[PDB]
Amino acid sequence: NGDKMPLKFKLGPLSYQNMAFITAKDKYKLYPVRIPRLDTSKEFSAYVSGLFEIYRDLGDDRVFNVNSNFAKEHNATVNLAMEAILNELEVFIGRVKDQDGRVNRFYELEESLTVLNCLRTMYFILDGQDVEENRSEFIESLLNWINRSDGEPDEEYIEQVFSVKDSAGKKVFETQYFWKLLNQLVLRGLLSQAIGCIERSDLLPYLSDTCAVSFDAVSDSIELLKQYPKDSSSTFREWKNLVLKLSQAFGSSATDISGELRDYIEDFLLVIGGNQRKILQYSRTWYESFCGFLLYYIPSLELSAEYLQMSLEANVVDITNDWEQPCVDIISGKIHSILPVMESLDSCTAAFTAMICEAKGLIENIFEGEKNSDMLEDLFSYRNGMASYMLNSFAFELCSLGDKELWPVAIGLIALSATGTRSAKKMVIAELLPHYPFVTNDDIEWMLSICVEWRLPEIAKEIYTTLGNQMLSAHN
Amino acid sequence: GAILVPMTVNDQPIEKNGDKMPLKFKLGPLSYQNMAFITAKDKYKLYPVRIPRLDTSKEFSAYVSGLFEIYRDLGDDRVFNVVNSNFAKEHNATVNLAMEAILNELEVFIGRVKDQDGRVNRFYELEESLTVLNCLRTMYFILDGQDVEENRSEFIESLLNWINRSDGEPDEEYIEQVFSVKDSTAGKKVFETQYFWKLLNQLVLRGLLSQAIGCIERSDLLPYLSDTCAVSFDAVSDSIELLKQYPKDSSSTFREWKNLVLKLSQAFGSSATDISGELRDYIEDFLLVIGGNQRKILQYSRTWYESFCGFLLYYIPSLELSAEYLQMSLEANVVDITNDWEQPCVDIISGKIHSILPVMESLDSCTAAFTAMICEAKGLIENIFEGEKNSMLEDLFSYRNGMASYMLNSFAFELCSLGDKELWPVAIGLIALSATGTRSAKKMVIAELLPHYPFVTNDDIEWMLSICVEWRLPEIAKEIYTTLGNQ
Amino acid sequence: PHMQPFDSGHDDLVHDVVYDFYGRHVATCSSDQHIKVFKLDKDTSNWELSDSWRAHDSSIVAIDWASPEYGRIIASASYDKTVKLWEEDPDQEECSGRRWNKLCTLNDSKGSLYSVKFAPAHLGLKLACLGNDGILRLYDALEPSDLRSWTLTSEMKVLSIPPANHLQSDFCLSWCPSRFSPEKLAVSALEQAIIYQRGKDGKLHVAAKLPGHKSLIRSISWAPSIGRWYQLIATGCKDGRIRIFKITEKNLQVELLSEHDDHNGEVWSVSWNLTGTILSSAGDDGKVRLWKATYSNEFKCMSVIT
Domains in chain B (CATH in brackets) are 1-50 (2.20.25.500), 51-487 (no CATH)
Neighbours of A52 (CB within 10 A): 21
Residues in chain C within 8 Å Cβ distance of B270: 192, 209, 211
User: Cα dihedral sign for B210, B212, B214, B216?
Assistant: negative
- Alpha carbon distances (Å) from A290 to A279, A303, A328: 9, 10, 10
Cα A69 to Cα A75: distance, rounded to the nearest angstrom: 10
Alpha carbon distances (Å) from A35 to A15, A383, C23, C295: 6, 29, 14, 21
Which chains does A contact via 3+ CB–CB distances below 8 A? B, C
Distance from CA of B386 to the nearest CA of A (A): 6
E strand segments, B155-289:
none
Domain total in chain C:
1
Closest residue on chain C to A398 (Cα): C275
Mutate to test the interface with B, among C298, C299, C300 (most CBs of B within 10 A): C298
Q: Check CB contact of C296 with chain B, cutoff 8 Å.
A: yes
End-to-end CA distance of chain A: 53
Contact C305 A20 (CB under 8 A): yes
Which residues make Cβ contacts (< 8 Å) with residue B292, sequence separation at least 6?
B258, B311, B314, B315, B316, C255
Query: Structural domain of residue C193, as residue ranges?
Result: 1-249+253-306
Partners of chain C (3+ Cβ pairs below 8 A): A, B
Residue A248 distance to chain C (closest CA, Å): 57
Which residues numbered 209-268 in A keep a CB inside 8 Å of some CB on B?
Answer: 233-234
Q: Which residues of B touch C257 (CB under 8 A)?
A: 293-294
Contact A23 C121 (CB under 8 A): no
Contacts of C208 in chain B (CB under 8 A): 266
Experimental method: X-ray
- Distance of alpha carbon A456 from alpha carbon A428, whole angstroms: 11
The neighbouring-strand residues paired with A475 are none
Q: Number of B:C CB contacts under 8 A?
A: 45
Q: Which residues of A touch B372 (CB under 8 A)?
A: none
Q: Does C294 touch chain B (CB under 8 A)?
A: yes
Q: Any chain B CB within 8 A of the CB of A372?
A: yes
CA separation for the pair A466, A474 (Å, rounded):
11
Beta sheet of C135-140, edge-to-edge order: C113-118, C126-131, C135-140, C151-157
CA–CA distance, B117 with A23 (Å, rounded to integer): 75
The CA distances from residue B143 to B37, B92, B156, B161, B196, in Å, are 57, 10, 11, 16, 36
* Pair A338, A329: CB distance under 8 Å: yes
| Contact predicate A91/A54, CB 8 Å | no
- The Cα A458–Cα A449 span in angstroms is 14
Q: Which of B143, B144, B346, B386 to probe by mutation at the A interface, max A CB count within 10 Å?
A: B386
Cross-chain Cβ contact C294/B324 below 8 Å: yes
Q: Which helix (H) or strand (E) holds B26?
A: strand B23-30
**Which of B147, B253, B384 should we substitute to test contact with A (largest number of A Cβ atoms within 10 Å)?**
B384
CB contact under 8 A, C13 and A28: yes
From A24, A396, A462, residue closest to C69, measured CB to CB: A462
Closest residue in C to A377 (Cα–Cα) = C229
A336 contact residues in B (CB cutoff 8 A): 323, 351
Give the chain C residue whose CA is nearest to the CA of B285: C212
| Chain C residues touching A389 at Cβ < 8 A | 295
For A323, the 3-state DSSP assignment is coil
Shortest alpha-carbon distance between residue B150 and chain C (Å): 21
Q: What angle do CA C254, C256, C257 make, to 5 degrees?
A: 125
CATH number at C228 reads 2.130.10.10
**Ranges assigned E (strand) in B232-360:** none
Q: Compute the distance between CA of residue B276 and CA of residue A68 in angstroms, rounded to an integer.
A: 72
**Are B295 and A356 a contacting pair, CB within 8 Å?**
no
A67 touches chain B (CB under 8 A): no
In C31-99, beta strands by DSSP E: 34-40, 47-54, 60-65, 73-78, 83-88
The answer to whether A394 touches A347, Cβ cutoff 8 Å, is: yes
| Listed residue (B301, B246, B252, B242) closest to B148, CA to CA | B252
Give the distance from CA B439 to its chain's centroid.
Answer: 34
Q: How far apart are the first and last CA of chain B?
A: 44
Resolution in units of Å: 2.9
Helix (H) or strand (E) holding A22: strand A17-22
CB contact under 8 A, A22 and C14: yes
Residue B326 C-alpha, separation from nearest chain C C-alpha, in angstroms = 11
Chain A positions in Cβ-Cβ contact with residue C68 (cut-off 8 Å): 466, 469-470
Measured CA to CA, the distance from residue B351 to residue B375 in angstroms comes to: 13
Minimum-distance CB partner of A334 among B252, B324, B351: B351
Among C9, C283, C290, beta carbon nearest to A35:
C290
Q: In this structure, are strands C25-30 and C279-283 parallel, antiparallel, or unpaired?
A: unpaired
Q: Which residues pair with C129 in a beta bridge?
A: C116, C137
Burial class (CB in 10 A: 0-12, 13-18, 19+), B475: exposed
Class of residue C281 by CB neighbours under 10 A (exposed 0-12, middle 13-18, buried 19+): buried
Using the Cβ of C211 and the Cβ atoms of chain B, whether some distance falls under 8 Å is answered with yes
Find chain A residues with C-beta within 8 A of B385's C-beta: 130, 300, 302
Give strand pairing partners of C157.
C135
Distance separating alpha carbons of residues B336 and A261, to the nearest angstrom: 47
Residue B385, chain A, CB below 8 Å: the answer is yes
